[PDB]
Write a protein that binds this ligand. Sequence first.
Ligand SMILES: NC(=O)[C@H]1CCCN(C(=O)Cc2cccnc2O)C1
Ligand SMILES: [Zn+2]
Length: 139
Amino acid sequence: SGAIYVGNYRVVNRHLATHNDWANLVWEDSSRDLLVSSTTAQGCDTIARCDCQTGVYYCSSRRKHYPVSFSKPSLIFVEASEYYPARYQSHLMLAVGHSEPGDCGGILRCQHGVVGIVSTGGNGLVGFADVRDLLWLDE
Ligand SMILES: NC(=O)[C@H]1CCCN(C(=O)Cc2cccnc2O)C1
Ligand SMILES: [Zn+2]
C-alpha cells in the first residue's frame, strides 16, 4: 500500500483504489495502473521533473529503502493477475530488486523528488509507475 499527496491530489495504484478514491475520481489510466483522487487537505510531496535513472524506493516487505538503477518509462508486458489480464503496461520503469504484491504504493524518490510508485514485481524485478510527466499534478 501507499499514496503520493501533492496539492489537492492523492495518487495511488489504480488496482488498490478505494470506494472513496472512485467517489472523488479526477483521473485514472488502466494501462498505467494509476488513479488520482481529489483531497480536502493540502499535500506537500514534491514531484520530480527530470530524466533521472537512479533513486531510492521503499520496500514494505523488508521495512527497508533500497538504492536502484531503473530503466526509462516504457511499454512493458505484465503477466496476468486477479486485477488485470495479461497486457502491456505503459510508463513503467524496471529495476533489479525485491517486490511482493503488498509492496505496491511504495514511493521511488530521486534527488529531485517523487519519481513514481511500485506497481509490479516478481522474478527479482521491481516495476514503478512513472508520475514525472503528469505536470498537471502541480496546479
Ligand atoms: N501493475 C500490475 O498489473 C500489477 C497488479 C498487482 C499484481 N502485480 C504484480 O506484479 C504484483 C506481484 C509481485 C510479485 C509477484 N507476483 C505479483 O503478481 C501486477
Ligand atoms: Zn531526478
